[PDB]
Amino acid sequence: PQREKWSSKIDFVLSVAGGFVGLGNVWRFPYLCYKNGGGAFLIPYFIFLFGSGLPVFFLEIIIGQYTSEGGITCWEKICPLFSGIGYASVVIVSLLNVYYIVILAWATYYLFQSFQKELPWAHCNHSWNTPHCMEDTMRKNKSTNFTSPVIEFWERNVLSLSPGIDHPGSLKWDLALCLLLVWLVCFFCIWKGVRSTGKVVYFTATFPFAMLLVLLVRGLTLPGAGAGIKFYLYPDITRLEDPQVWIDAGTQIFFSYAICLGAMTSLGSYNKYKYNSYRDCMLLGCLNSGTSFVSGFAIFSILGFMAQEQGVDIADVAESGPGLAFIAYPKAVTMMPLPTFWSILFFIMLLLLGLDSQFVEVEGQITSLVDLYPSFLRKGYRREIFIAFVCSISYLLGLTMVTEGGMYVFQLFDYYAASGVCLLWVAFFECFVIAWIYGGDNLYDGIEDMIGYRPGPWMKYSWAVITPVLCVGCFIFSLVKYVPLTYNKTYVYPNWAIGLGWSLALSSMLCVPLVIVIRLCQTEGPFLVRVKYLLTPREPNRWAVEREGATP
């Protein structure tokens, strides 16, 4: 048959908007900004945004629309050599789906804990509370060893943090059921009803932004919001000399935009050929980066309020790692009237934000993997078993991040697996193939035919110059000034853990060289002839079904 198009352009926007607006905006951005100083994170953030985030996102969407193919076969059409970009993106999205559902497991645990008379993270007189704990309101009335009740709940009850990754501990069975529950929700929403949220499109889309608005109003009116905002906005120039703020800000844009994963290319292949996706991507790009910037005001206002309440520095009031959104927002919902009611909504809001993202990504890899075996899969019961097998195996590897030492494994996955140099590796090669091998101007001819007009030179120069320079420059300077990964500024990772972390990165990075070697070996002839034949596009726009032109 053929790849079914979208019912209407409104479905493309909502599927895309729900695919990369979520935990990457409200969870990962606040703590990466928090970890890398304050506002010094924003300069590389906006530089990378306007240089390579929107351009690469639009490039992925337009490649999918031009080839009408998934993550992998689109690159086979565009350039048979360097086809390893698709396999690299599939590996990256597999690892991402592995560790990205643990966040939803934690959110589900918090939501289940929210159903009681008093929030468990309001006061600290429970079993898990260390005698070092003290009420935040009593912190000033009452050195550097008085933990807040909110941080204890995260490290003592929700995570049961162990001494280190070398100390796995026991599998938190309460979190293991929550991790299983969200996977069953993902499994039941992937097999039956791939896109079945059509009845509640209005509620499931406007509510997460409606809930984020209340958090912003509550945070901004807090007494300490002034100091938190100045920390969030005003930059520190000396921090820009560190290569880590550029890697974090550069790959946060790539993470938040879901690029180098094959999801955007697949989502871009479901719309009509003669559809102006250039305008809609720019609007969706504003909605994505706008949500991260605006929601950053809310979380950093609470951080400023917490610092004033506890009489501590803003940079030391919460966790410099994952769980900042689980320390700040659960503190904000305490301050609201009827804290239990608002706590339920936030973790429901946090869960729909991530479930929609997980649906797009998990369906993204499964569709991409089916394209490799179109007859073996997507045919009868064979898709039943394969979907469950992917969900089951990716759930078992998610169990290693649920044990008491599972937080340290989560930091390794979040820093190496689907972020960091692995994303810079794929993003550079996506732009290098299009801009220099395929041709930047050679693709504008396709885009002009496809969207109706020739775009400006912003996209062309971003692929040709800015993105390779930003990706290579951040890659070279990161290895030159090597700083090993740390958890919460204190824990130092053992050598094997870093080596394990690089294996997660290098497993997808080496997909590009391996396929080049595989393709060169398969093709017969002189080496220069072998390279020449594998670089020629094989009719990317092979879809007469629609009024189209030709690749040349």
Ligand SMILES: *[C@@H]1O[C@H](CO)[C@@H](O)[C@H](O)[C@H]1NC(C)=O
């Ligand atoms: C907290 O640290 C202070 C200063 O070192 C020390 O005097 C006090 O005994 C500590 N209290 C607890 C509960 O550990």
Ligand SMILES: CCCCCCCCCCCCCC
């Ligand atoms: C009246 C209640 C709302 C108060 C909002 C406070 C906003 C503070 C703005 C500080 C900006 C600093 C930029 C460097």
Ligand SMILES: CCCCCCCCCCCC
């Ligand atoms: C803010 C840093 C990145 C901005 C990239 C804009 C590039 C515009 C195209 C230049 C044409 C000469």
Ligand SMILES: CCCCCCCCCCCC
């Ligand atoms: C997990 C290790 C990498 C798996 C993917 C390797 C790519 C092989 C492509 C073979 C077909 C050309």
Ligand SMILES: CCCCCCCCCCCC
């Ligand atoms: C700066 C890097 C330039 C790379 C040039 C590659 C040229 C390949 C041409 C293939 C045409 C089908």
Ligand SMILES: CCCCCCCCCC
């Ligand atoms: C390695 C992380 C889990 C990957 C499971 C799905 C991809 C492989 C299917 C055979």
Ligand SMILES: CCCCCCCCCC
């Ligand atoms: C900087 C982000 C917007 C770029 C649009 C203008 C491109 C410059 C040449 C007209």
Ligand SMILES: CCCCCCCCC
């Ligand atoms: C529903 C929005 C919450 C805003 C809280 C304002 C507190 C004023 C006392």
Ligand SMILES: CCCCCCCC
């Ligand atoms: C054919 C590519 C399979 C990739 C699965 C992901 C393993 C890390």
Ligand SMILES: CCCCCCCC
């Ligand atoms: C809370 C979501 C705000 C979105 C703003 C979009 C325009 C910058």
Ligand SMILES: CCCCCCCC
């Ligand atoms: C690695 C220690 C925890 C084991 C949980 C299950 C892993 C397959």
Ligand SMILES: CCCCCCCC
């Ligand atoms: C793979 C580069 C860093 C590895 C550090 C630990 C090696 C055992």
Ligand SMILES: CCCCCCC
């Ligand atoms: C990850 C959960 C998958 C369950 C499949 C049951 C057939």
Ligand SMILES: CCCCCCC
């Ligand atoms: C992060 C991209 C590095 C490219 C190196 C090419 C040899």
Ligand SMILES: CCCCCC
């Ligand atoms: C000064 C803070 C305003 C925030 C608007 C989103």
Ligand SMILES: [Cl-]
């Ligand atoms: Cl973002």
